[PDB]
Amino acid sequence: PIGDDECEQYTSSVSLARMLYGGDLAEWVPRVHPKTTIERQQHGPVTFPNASAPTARCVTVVRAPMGSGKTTALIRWLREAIHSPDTSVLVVSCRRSFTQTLATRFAESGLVDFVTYFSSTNRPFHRLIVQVESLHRVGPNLLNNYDVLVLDEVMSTLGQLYSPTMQQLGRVDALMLRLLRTCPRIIAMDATANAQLVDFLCGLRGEKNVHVVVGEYAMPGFSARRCLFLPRLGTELLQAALRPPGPPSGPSPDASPDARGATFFGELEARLGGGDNICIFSSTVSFAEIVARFCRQFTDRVLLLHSLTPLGDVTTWGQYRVVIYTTVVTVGLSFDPLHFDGMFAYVKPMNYGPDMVSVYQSLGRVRTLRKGELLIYMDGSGARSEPVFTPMLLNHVVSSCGQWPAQFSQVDTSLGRGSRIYNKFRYKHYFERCTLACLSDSLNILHMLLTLNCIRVRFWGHDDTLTPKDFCLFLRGVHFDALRAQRDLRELRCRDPEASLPAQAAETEEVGLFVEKYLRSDVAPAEIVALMRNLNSLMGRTRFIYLALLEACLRVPMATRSSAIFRRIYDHYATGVIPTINVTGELELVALPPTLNVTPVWELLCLCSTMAARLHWDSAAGGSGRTFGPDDVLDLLTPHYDRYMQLVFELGHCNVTDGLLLSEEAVKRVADALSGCPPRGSVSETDHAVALFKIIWGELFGVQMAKSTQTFPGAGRVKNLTKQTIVGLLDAHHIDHSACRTHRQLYALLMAHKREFAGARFKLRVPAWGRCLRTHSSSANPNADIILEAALSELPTEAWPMMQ
Amino acid sequence: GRPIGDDECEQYTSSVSLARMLYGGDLAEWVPRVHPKTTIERQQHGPVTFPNASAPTARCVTVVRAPMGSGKTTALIRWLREAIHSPDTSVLVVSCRRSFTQTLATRFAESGLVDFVTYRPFHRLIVQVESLHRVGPNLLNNYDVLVLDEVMSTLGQLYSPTMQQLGRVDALMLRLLRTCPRIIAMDATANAQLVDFLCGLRGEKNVHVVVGEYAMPGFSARRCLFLPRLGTELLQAALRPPGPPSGPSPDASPDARGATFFGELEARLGGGDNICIFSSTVSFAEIVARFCRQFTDRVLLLHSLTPLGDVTTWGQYRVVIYTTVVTVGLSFDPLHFDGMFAYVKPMNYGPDMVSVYQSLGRVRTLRKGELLIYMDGSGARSEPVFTPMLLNHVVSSCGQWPAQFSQVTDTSLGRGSRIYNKFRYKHYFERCTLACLSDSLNILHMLLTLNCIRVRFWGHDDTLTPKDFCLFLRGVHFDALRAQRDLRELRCRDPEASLPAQAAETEEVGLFVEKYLRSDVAPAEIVALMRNLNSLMGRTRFIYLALLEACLRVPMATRSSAIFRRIYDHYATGVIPTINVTGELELVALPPTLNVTPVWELLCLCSTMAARLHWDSAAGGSGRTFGPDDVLDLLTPHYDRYMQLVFELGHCNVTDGLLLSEEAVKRVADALSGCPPRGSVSETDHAVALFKIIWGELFGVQMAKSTQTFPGAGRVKNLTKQTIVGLLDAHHIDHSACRTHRQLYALLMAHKREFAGARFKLRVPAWGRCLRTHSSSANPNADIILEAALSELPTEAWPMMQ
DNA sequence: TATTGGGACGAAGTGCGAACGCTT
DNA sequence: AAGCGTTCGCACTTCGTCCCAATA
Ligand SMILES: Nc1ncnc2c1ncn2[C@@H]1O[C@H](COP(=O)(O)OP(=O)(O)OP(O)(O)=S)[C@@H](O)[C@H]1O
Ligand SMILES: Nc1ncnc2c1ncn2[C@@H]1O[C@H](COP(=O)(O)OP(=O)(O)OP(O)(O)=S)[C@@H](O)[C@H]1O
Ligand SMILES: [Mg+2]
């Protein structure tokens, strides 16, 4: 059955997909803002207003397809809008492609230059072209006046702000809100400019001054393209091909009438066998490596491009007969020649993957396809949840003046925030990442982005039109016909020498969720696989979890003091599930068991956190920032020396071998290590203290007390002596001082006296992995875990059994 | 011996100096240093008395930091009879404590038309500040005179978990402070940050400060003595069971530093004295009662679960043990008690040293002027909180406080606006210092000393150097480490009494109440929950029910797998307390399941059908009636997967952990086996047979047959709004008679026989009704902060385009 | 059969003259 | 605008772990 809800749910899903990308702009703008005029340009390349006459409005905002001549229309308009040779202008881009292109492509203008590296002068800057992420180092030189302003891919330009790669955001936001107050004329343009951008520009220069252009033409490469969403993956034809041949008789009994739906690997076979040239988008690497291993049976001259392969220019694609690629082509350049006969795409919505806008910008990287084909498969395994674009959202968004909620719905404890610019467009980054949780919604977003570029999207069977029934009956197929095939992509998965294990590991959800919690977000997958290989062994798990608790008790200093708070930290970091790679190269989950009595662990991190602070510990910076002699080690331990001796002894043979950290192997290592320690009083304190220090750091956390070459103490080498830091090394050792004021002479004094600073020194070095945990210095955008640590350090423990 | 040197002198010197600055021990030193224009006076003889209210020298706003026991309210009577002229003059008096709401309206005889808290004409009104959200919007906008009695307590109850309309009560208080011309404020621990806040809003020249230095004999001129030893070796010999008393031992031969609590108690109680005993914990109050019962029969106990007696009931008894209940009751005035003992214990979920201080002053005058205090540091082992790094940062910055221990700045919770933000530091350092014994001890030593009482530590008759304090401190830390063993082999042993007070003191149980439950709960209903929670089925039903409510609070969790791992790992893993059948408390682990999809796919179904109902586990089960007509409409929209999961969960190949455990999967398979196949049976009757197993086995919530005469509300003794007219046209026929709601009910009394059908409601069992749920209201814990994060932050792409 | 002592190479620092930034 | 306070390119080497080949 249809189930009643599906008419309302489909029609809501399609309507919000249309609204978020501005598919309704020709109806909404003349209804809600009568003082704004709107242009529809229904044929031929786009054209802007008159570039010189006084009758044109000063703010014009353009929604116009990918591949419709927009750079040519901007060239035609900018050469006029620069009114005089003294007129000065600024151009902003999100994408790298225009920073290289526009400065090279403008021939109708002079003194134009790309992003600033070495031209710094003091100030001359006009006709500057910039990547928005780099704007912070250029801002002071702009002098805060321009006569003309241009934004292309403006929803990407205001969309870069949400990405973790932008830094010093608030000061760049405060500059963006300085240009945009219509000191210049403004032109703003995108393929998906929307109602909320037209509204926001009214909020900077009023309804009277805003003009809207809507383009509905795109080049033959797109307007003749005939996308088709297939019903079934066809892995049974893959298993007959990529594997060695099956038995001479007894094939699979299912799907004998083709299951009345053409299949991706079935259709791919025909074009490669017919001698066509072809190209293959793949949103995940694990399928890219599989379809490479398939294609070499039909045509040996395959190419494969993904984020761990080396740099290769798009001009090289003329030689190869199959080119396979992932979303790395977004930051590349268009393939302008005519070569490929058609195109295939495996799109897979998943929680840590690409947005459907990022897929659409990658499909468009080959311009003309000779037959006009394109076949897309949407793999619904891993995205089969209840929808996000509900009729409960539609009624709210359509009753309001087109304004969206800032969360999943209306509301309230929240972060500090940027300006009106950052907060106005936060709704779009939210729903671009929520909708990946559903295969409908994701399919209706992708279906919109294609249908806004004239691409005649079709399903299987339904050559022309679909009712709500026809659509809902289609997804009851691809939800099941994908899931029952998914097991094949575990058997076929690469264990050959070509296998990109660092890429195929990181693709999983379980690794994504570990990287979010424990590590720095900028780690290379190659260093995660060096870590996850250690965390398989029970000793390796133990050291990593002790070192994660040491870092947390430095970040949250209240954890060293209240026992109630340390239970909340221990339950969050040192319990649950981790991913690990076993001796075979397969990836397996491991459960970390809880412990009832955390007291023996807490007393030992409580006595190590104060001994780490005093050595300027930061595991992201390699280890201890300060060198110590053996006498300094004695001075670290001496205040609590008998208590270090007690707690190192107790963990050798605890009452119960509970949880992870007091497990049977973990207790044995410390009991073993105590056999090599000199007995108390048999050797000098400066020796016994070193012998105990090396055991408590060495077995629990794994960190070595290495020698170091530093010819003066503290953090600084001889290259970084300063007029301040010299004096501390004149006070100690009582050097004669009374020197000449000039630092050249203070250096020459110590380089004569350097023999005073002979003698042994040590430094703590962290073990190769573990140099990538999120330490106290390693700042990043807030995740849910950084919020929880900010909660523990700010809210006090309020009393329970109360007189009200 | 043990080394001390001078390394630890900064710890004491910082600790004592920060304690001083928090409670205002440096008014009339800091004021000339930082605000020279503000006038200051010292009163050192007899009662305090405020400046004349009638003269031209009646400047603006006055703040008073007079001791307890120095005549605050009588000096206010003198000042207010000079401040009130003609009856048209306008006044308001604010109190935090209940005691003045009863007292002042009864005690004022020099004035008329005065009244206590309200249950347009309003003047001479006296109010509890916890009523200000009801009272405030009914008041006139400005008054000629304003009294803030116990001001630091008045804007102190403002931080209470049960406070209402906080975002407007901050603004109401600010409006009164901004434009009332004459104001007086009177807390015995007023401080420099209240001086600064009023100097900010009214100007440095305007404010005047009164500092009291004398308090009446007996009331606040005792001889407080701290003792170094509890003396439990005497206790466990004294509480010897029947038979022989047993012989002495040579371990008693040491000097015991010359004094012990149980020794100095016994020597006076045997010597004929009548003795109160305060105890911060009930588990010690119930022991020291038994130690007196063998010496005399006239022994009371008054802990928080007993019926509260009026203090005139005391004075019959030889002993009257009590525990912080007297925070909200009247003070005992008669000269009955010879002396008094206290046991104070810093605890992370216990009462703070200012709440302990005003519990010791609830007995007023003593026949020999003595008071002996023991600080049990056994659960305050930790490193100091009042560090020199905090002292330097505060003292360098004009004495401004940082309001968190990190000294660093981003959750903008901001429930108030300005008063809430200015004073937030005080509640934070009042709770944090209970983590440590030295810092709790130096606060309590200050609060006694800044109220005239001479404080001594036993054996140090003249004065303490930092080293002398550090010797006494490490001593009493060792005493409480040893003596705590005796207090565990001794116990109440449950004479059919006080299990909830013995349970509730445990820090493991506080952690359970703040994570899962409503903070409204009494100890009595925690015990019967934790006693159920010991059974393996009980603890499985509880955690399925806790997860169902989180799936209604966070609506992304029912649709993102990455989000449901954050919720599952938090509400369904880790350690919980339980009560064993033996009558003792035991911790039990919830082990981490590797694969959660079998659970997520079930909650994803239950939290959609629970939203077709109005499910609300604190208010009932279902807020809505339903029947076998409706149950078909619950199951049939998504039936293709409901058919599998309840059967398949009973037949899984492997058992990852609790929610899929060997006991649970057999139990659900056995229960489900009574369901027919889809053949030779009614679809509705098959549907409801399945429905009772899904809800009944896994969540523990049964059906009950409807007593409602109509759908929704349907009692007939009295009518309720819209419940008749909202059904009167639902039968698709017109009555045309009348529109007045009440008398129309007779029309539905015809329809009752054709509205009829089999109708039911889900109901939550007696243990389940104290969960924190989506309909509830409370102040933010770390967990409500987390659920705001999971719902408001989207999930970023990780293997990124680097 | 008997088990370890010698060689390679990552990686963090030495020390000369110098470069950048600044204000006589 | 010459003297001058942080910071460094380059050629050199010292520490510790990996590995193997020559003994037994
Ligand atoms: N590097 C280039 N060389 C030549 N023409 C280019 C180049 N980059 C862009 N174009 C122009 O781009 C037009 C395609 O339509 P447009 O809407 O202008 O594409 P666009 O929005 O610039 O897309 P891209 O992704 O930036 S090429 C072509 O007709 C070209 O004239
Ligand atoms: N509860 C009370 N019972 C009797 N007299 C009281 C009481 N409270 C105040 N007084 C009178 O006011 C003075 C004592 O008040 P203080 O101890 O200085 O401060 P207070 O806060 O008013 O006392 P409390 O807290 O109300 S017991 C004496 O003159 C008493 O006669
Ligand atoms: Mg463009």
mmCIF file with all atom_site columns, C-alpha atoms in Angstrom, chain B residues 67-73 97 100 150 215-222 276 311 314 322 326 329-340 357-371 451 453:
data_model
loop_
_atom_site.group_PDB
_atom_site.id
_atom_site.type_symbol
_atom_site.label_atom_id
_atom_site.label_alt_id
_atom_site.label_comp_id
_atom_site.label_asym_id
_atom_site.label_entity_id
_atom_site.label_seq_id
_atom_site.pdbx_PDB_ins_code
_atom_site.Cartn_x
_atom_site.Cartn_y
_atom_site.Cartn_z
_atom_site.occupancy
_atom_site.B_iso_or_equiv
_atom_site.pdbx_formal_charge
_atom_site.auth_seq_id
_atom_site.auth_comp_id
_atom_site.auth_asym_id
_atom_site.auth_atom_id
_atom_site.pdbx_PDB_model_num
ATOM 1  C CA . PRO B 1 67  ? 27.558 40.336 62.772 1.00 0.00 ? 67  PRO B CA 1
ATOM 2  C CA . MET B 1 68  ? 24.886 37.789 63.677 1.00 0.00 ? 68  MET B CA 1
ATOM 3  C CA . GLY B 1 69  ? 23.814 38.565 67.277 1.00 0.00 ? 69  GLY B CA 1
ATOM 4  C CA . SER B 1 70  ? 24.302 42.403 67.132 1.00 0.00 ? 70  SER B CA 1
ATOM 5  C CA . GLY B 1 71  ? 20.770 43.882 66.818 1.00 0.00 ? 71  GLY B CA 1
ATOM 6  C CA . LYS B 1 72  ? 20.237 44.153 63.034 1.00 0.00 ? 72  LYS B CA 1
ATOM 7  C CA . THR B 1 73  ? 16.392 44.040 63.108 1.00 0.00 ? 73  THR B CA 1
ATOM 8  C CA . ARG B 1 97  ? 14.590 33.545 54.939 1.00 0.00 ? 97  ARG B CA 1
ATOM 9  C CA . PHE B 1 100 ? 11.346 37.357 58.943 1.00 0.00 ? 100 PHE B CA 1
ATOM 10 C CA . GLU B 1 150 ? 20.003 39.415 54.157 1.00 0.00 ? 150 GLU B CA 1
ATOM 11 C CA . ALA B 1 215 ? 27.979 41.018 69.153 1.00 0.00 ? 215 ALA B CA 1
ATOM 12 C CA . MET B 1 216 ? 26.148 40.128 72.379 1.00 0.00 ? 216 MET B CA 1
ATOM 13 C CA . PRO B 1 217 ? 27.664 37.778 75.048 1.00 0.00 ? 217 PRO B CA 1
ATOM 14 C CA . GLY B 1 218 ? 26.594 34.144 74.688 1.00 0.00 ? 218 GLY B CA 1
ATOM 15 C CA . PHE B 1 219 ? 24.840 34.793 71.311 1.00 0.00 ? 219 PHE B CA 1
ATOM 16 C CA . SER B 1 220 ? 28.217 35.147 69.547 1.00 0.00 ? 220 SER B CA 1
ATOM 17 C CA . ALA B 1 221 ? 30.955 35.112 72.275 1.00 0.00 ? 221 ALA B CA 1
ATOM 18 C CA . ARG B 1 222 ? 31.462 31.335 72.753 1.00 0.00 ? 222 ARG B CA 1
ATOM 19 C CA . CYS B 1 276 ? 22.661 19.524 71.500 1.00 0.00 ? 276 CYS B CA 1
ATOM 20 C CA . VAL B 1 311 ? 12.026 24.399 69.334 1.00 0.00 ? 311 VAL B CA 1
ATOM 21 C CA . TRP B 1 314 ? 13.359 21.073 73.392 1.00 0.00 ? 314 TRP B CA 1
ATOM 22 C CA . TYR B 1 322 ? 19.495 17.430 64.510 1.00 0.00 ? 322 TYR B CA 1
ATOM 23 C CA . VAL B 1 326 ? 16.800 24.128 61.347 1.00 0.00 ? 326 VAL B CA 1
ATOM 24 C CA . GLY B 1 329 ? 12.952 27.174 61.480 1.00 0.00 ? 329 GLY B CA 1
ATOM 25 C CA . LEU B 1 330 ? 13.084 29.504 64.500 1.00 0.00 ? 330 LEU B CA 1
ATOM 26 C CA . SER B 1 331 ? 16.059 29.828 66.873 1.00 0.00 ? 331 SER B CA 1
ATOM 27 C CA . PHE B 1 332 ? 16.085 28.267 70.375 1.00 0.00 ? 332 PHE B CA 1
ATOM 28 C CA . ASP B 1 333 ? 16.360 31.167 72.872 1.00 0.00 ? 333 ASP B CA 1
ATOM 29 C CA . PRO B 1 334 ? 16.236 29.640 76.489 1.00 0.00 ? 334 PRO B CA 1
ATOM 30 C CA . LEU B 1 335 ? 19.372 29.004 78.589 1.00 0.00 ? 335 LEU B CA 1
ATOM 31 C CA . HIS B 1 336 ? 18.876 25.195 78.741 1.00 0.00 ? 336 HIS B CA 1
ATOM 32 C CA . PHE B 1 337 ? 21.915 23.659 77.021 1.00 0.00 ? 337 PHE B CA 1
ATOM 33 C CA . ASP B 1 338 ? 25.269 23.533 78.792 1.00 0.00 ? 338 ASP B CA 1
ATOM 34 C CA . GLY B 1 339 ? 27.192 23.096 75.545 1.00 0.00 ? 339 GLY B CA 1
ATOM 35 C CA . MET B 1 340 ? 26.944 21.764 72.011 1.00 0.00 ? 340 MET B CA 1
ATOM 36 C CA . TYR B 1 357 ? 27.285 28.219 59.970 1.00 0.00 ? 357 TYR B CA 1
ATOM 37 C CA . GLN B 1 358 ? 23.664 29.351 60.206 1.00 0.00 ? 358 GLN B CA 1
ATOM 38 C CA . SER B 1 359 ? 22.723 25.854 61.484 1.00 0.00 ? 359 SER B CA 1
ATOM 39 C CA . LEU B 1 360 ? 25.094 26.339 64.497 1.00 0.00 ? 360 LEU B CA 1
ATOM 40 C CA . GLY B 1 361 ? 23.527 29.672 65.416 1.00 0.00 ? 361 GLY B CA 1
ATOM 41 C CA . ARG B 1 362 ? 19.999 28.170 65.659 1.00 0.00 ? 362 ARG B CA 1
ATOM 42 C CA . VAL B 1 363 ? 20.740 27.453 69.341 1.00 0.00 ? 363 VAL B CA 1
ATOM 43 C CA . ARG B 1 364 ? 21.372 30.889 70.879 1.00 0.00 ? 364 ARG B CA 1
ATOM 44 C CA . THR B 1 365 ? 22.766 30.872 74.468 1.00 0.00 ? 365 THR B CA 1
ATOM 45 C CA . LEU B 1 366 ? 24.748 28.180 76.350 1.00 0.00 ? 366 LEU B CA 1
ATOM 46 C CA . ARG B 1 367 ? 25.331 27.722 80.113 1.00 0.00 ? 367 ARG B CA 1
ATOM 47 C CA . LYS B 1 368 ? 29.163 27.287 79.907 1.00 0.00 ? 368 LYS B CA 1
ATOM 48 C CA . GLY B 1 369 ? 29.694 28.894 76.450 1.00 0.00 ? 369 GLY B CA 1
ATOM 49 C CA . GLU B 1 370 ? 31.343 25.841 74.795 1.00 0.00 ? 370 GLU B CA 1
ATOM 50 C CA . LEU B 1 371 ? 31.159 24.409 71.250 1.00 0.00 ? 371 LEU B CA 1
ATOM 51 C CA . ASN B 1 451 ? 30.993 36.894 63.993 1.00 0.00 ? 451 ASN B CA 1
ATOM 52 C CA . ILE B 1 453 ? 33.441 34.038 68.410 1.00 0.00 ? 453 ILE B CA 1
#
